[PDB]
């Protein structure tokens, strides 16, 4: 077969570009190693900026999202004993944050894509990348057992952390930054009641933990827990249990419990690689970078990469520019180490470590107290916490 | 001999008190371990906030500093080939820093006092502190060969990092918190005329460097080096130099180079000790807390603490409210904390540190491309840097 953009990964990063573009008339394949079902079986994010929540808009796909979707205009942190809020309309400049599930996300641009009858191969297993730098790529895959041949111009790598298109690179072309943090977050989704109309951050002794939600009657709630655990250890009771006591005292008495009906731990770490491209391979997504989720970063950071790749394919098909297909990296990795600073931030301040000194200790419980009680310091994070703008 | 209160170490943190003290009737006597000269040979700070120029003007040592200290409404900030500038004036509500140096503020305050005829004995050995906890606490000295006993109400432990009051409090009851970072700052004084009418602060792959000023005719400049390199091992060539080497390539062939007239290594640390009294002990200045240099607020804190101890001394003695003195240390903390914030992160983003991975090294340089350009996080170092309200 042929196309013009192929996609490998049809996870948000992938189905958003392939609606993007198939809006646009440039046509697109869209490949995936597993199951729509186990795609929508992931239940990660959940904080979406306005930046994305336009984009969607602009990629048709946004009916639902504005009838479910809960729009925040500030947050909570709680640590030492008061509970602080973060009002990100005003210190925003007027922004704010909407509240849709990933799975959601994925379930509504699946919905969109099926409609469009524009091509997504599921179960595309032995997915290799080939001829990136000459001025025609290839992929080739398997389907049940068969090697089938897809031509196109440009490949797009959205296939996440551990996907193929990031390994076709020479690795000496790549210099990667990371850093792997030593504690995981215990994801627990219930199908009760919100403890409150807006998310709660607290840092707490016994560690970190976070009160989310995917809508009036269901939750999402996270503690922090080492690496060595498994969710096996972790029962309903005993998670509930732990909550409660990381929480505040007014906040846990409120709290309705229940059920699990996903369970599981994500390991925290923060990856960066540069540059972003390869010839016609561009990677967007957690293809390129990872974020620990106490920013709520990750999805969005995608997004943005995404809008720029869309737009720069765009200027070089219809305005027959491809030279700007160069500046890619270059325009992304800006945003990027942004939200990475922040993400690093918000997770080096809620989150407790293991072997930290008295002095490191202090200096966590003052950066709270400076940047909660300063305006300017408040300001810094309500901007960073909407989105800083995409260029 | 007896008085009401005793103040160890005439540096100026005793002589702030002493004379605002003697200028409100409240008796009392300075102990120094030194001769004059040499607490007039430490060349130490230059930077001065609002709060510390207003304090020394209800001193009533004021005249020689509004006529010499130089009003800085800005500072800059030097980093990967582009210099960057902090309006302070706007960004902190109207506020400004004064450069007038330290040997200079005691100078005037040395004459103050003198001129006063209140009590100051230099070359007070043997300093030994009695009775904290009782009615009638006492200090005893060696004057020549002589043992004398001063009497008094309350002694204030003006006596530096390395002074005798911190060791007379009981171990148990002090906990301390610190942090040694390991590399020091190379001073050098110079007869020169400045290299800018504001200061330039630099972080460059071979490290830390500092311009500043002591007036129009005289320099104050510093550089990054080791704990192990010894102030012989640099000569004058060699630290400009260097110097250059650190800079702008724009701001290297404007400076004039000349001959030094102080040259030494200050060795960064964190400090501080909680509580900050015992009995009718009330430590202020560098003998409960160290901040390293690169905020400019030792002597700023000092004179916070000074200020906070004779405005508390004052509702003891006339107004006959003694209670008030317990909450010393509770008021003094927190501005100490939020102070200590300030100094470790402009430590931490503007130094070279050592076995630094690829991953903090972005984060370093984010750090400063976000706070140097967002109007919220550029108001953060400016409120920062003029100084918190004393409360
Ligand atoms: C617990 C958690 C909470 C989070 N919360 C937030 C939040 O509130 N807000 C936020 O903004 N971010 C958050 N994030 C992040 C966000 O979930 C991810 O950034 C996002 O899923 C990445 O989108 P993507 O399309 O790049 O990657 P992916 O979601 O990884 O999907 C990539 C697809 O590629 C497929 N694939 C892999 N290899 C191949 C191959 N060889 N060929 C073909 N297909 C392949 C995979 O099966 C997958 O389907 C969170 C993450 C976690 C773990
Ligand atoms: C290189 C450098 C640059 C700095 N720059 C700045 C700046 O720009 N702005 C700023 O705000 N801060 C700055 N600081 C800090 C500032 O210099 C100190 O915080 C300040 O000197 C402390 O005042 P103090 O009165 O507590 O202490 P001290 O200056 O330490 O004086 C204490 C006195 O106690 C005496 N003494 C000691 N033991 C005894 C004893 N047993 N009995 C009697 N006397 C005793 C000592 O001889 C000394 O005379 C800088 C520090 C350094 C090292």
């Known amino acids: 077969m042929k196309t013009q953009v192929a996609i490998i990964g049809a996870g948000p990063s992938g189905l958003l570009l392939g609606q993007l573009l198939?809006?646009?008339?440039?046509?697109?394949?869209?490949?995936?190693?597993?199951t729509p079902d186990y795609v929508l079986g992931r239940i990660r994010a959940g904080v979406l900026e306005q930046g994305m929540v336009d984009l969607l808009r602009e990629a048709g796909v946004?009916?639902?999202?504005?009838?479910?979707?809960?729009?925040?205009?500030?947050?909570?942190?709680?640590?030492?004993?008061?509970?602080r809020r973060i009002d990100l309309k005003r210190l925003s400049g007027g922004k704010t944050?909407?509240?849709?599930?990933?799975?959601?996300?994925?379930?509504?641009?699946?919905?969109a894509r099926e409609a469009s009858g524009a091509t997504t191969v599921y179960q595309a297993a032995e997915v290799r990348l080939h001829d990136l730098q000459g001025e025609r790529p290839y992929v080739t895959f398997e389907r049940d057992?068969?090697?089938?041949?897809?031509?196109?111009?440009?490949?797009?790598?959205?296939?996440?952390?551990?996907?193929?298109?990031?390994?076709?690179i020479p690795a000496e072309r790549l210099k990667v930054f990371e850093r792997v943090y030593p504690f995981g977050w215990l994801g627990l989704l219930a199908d009760t009641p919100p403890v409150s109309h807006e998310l709660i951050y607290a840092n707490h002794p016994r560690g970190f933990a976070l009160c989310s939600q995917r809508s009036a009657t269901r939750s999402?709630?996270?503690?922090?827990?080492?690496?060595?655990?498994?969710?096996?250890?972790?029962?309903?009771?005993?998670?509930?249990?732990?909550?409660?006591?990381?929480?505040?005292?007014?906040?846990?008495?409120?709290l309705v419990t229940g059920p699990s009906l996903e369970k599981s731990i994500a390991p925290l770490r923060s990856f960066v690689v540069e540059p972003m491209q390869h010839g016609r391979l561009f990677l967007a997504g957690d293809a390129a970078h990872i974020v620990p989720?106490?920013?709520?970063?990750?999805?969005?950071?995608?997004?943005?990469?995404?809008?720029?790749?869309?737009?720069?394919?765009?200027?070089?098909?219809?305005?027959?520019?491809?030279?700007?297909?160069?500046?890619?990296?270059?325009?992304?990795?800006?945003?990027?180490?942004?939200?990475?600073?922040?993400?690093?931030?918000?997770?080096?301040?809620?989150?407790?470590?293991?072997?930290t000194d008295?002095?490191?200790?202090?200096?966590?419980?003052?950066?709270?107290?400076?940047?909660?009680?300063?305006?300017?310091?408040?300001?810094?994070?309500?901007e960073n916490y909407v989105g800083l703008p995409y260029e």
Chains 1, 2 share one sequence.
């Open 358 to 382: 008295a002095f490191s200790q202090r200096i966590q419980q003052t950066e709270l107290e400076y940047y909660l009680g300063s305006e300017a310091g408040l300001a810094t994070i309500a």
């Open 97 to 111: 944050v909407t509240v849709y599930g990933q799975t959601e996300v994925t379930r509504d641009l699946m919905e």
């Open 62 to 83: 946004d009916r639902r999202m504005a009838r479910d979707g809960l729009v925040h205009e500030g947050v909570e942190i709680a640590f030492a004993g008061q509970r």
């Open 220 to 254: 999402r709630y996270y503690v922090q827990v080492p690496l060595t655990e498994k969710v096996e250890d972790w029962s309903d009771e005993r998670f509930w249990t732990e909550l409660k006591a990381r929480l505040p005292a007014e906040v846990a008495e409120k």
């Open 145 to 168: 057992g068969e090697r089938l041949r897809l031509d196109c111009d440009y490949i797009a790598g959205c296939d996440g952390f551990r996907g193929i298109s990031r390994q076709s």
């Open 22 to 34: 198939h809006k646009a008339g440039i046509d697109n394949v869209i490949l995936e190693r597993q």
């Open 293 to 355: 989720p106490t920013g709520a970063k990750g999805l969005n950071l995608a997004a943005s990469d995404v809008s720029t790749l869309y737009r720069l394919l765009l200027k070089a098909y219809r305005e027959g520019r491809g030279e700007l297909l160069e500046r890619y990296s270059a325009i992304c990795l800006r945003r990027i180490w942004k939200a990475e600073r922040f993400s690093w931030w918000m997770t080096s301040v809620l989150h407790r470590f293991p072997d």
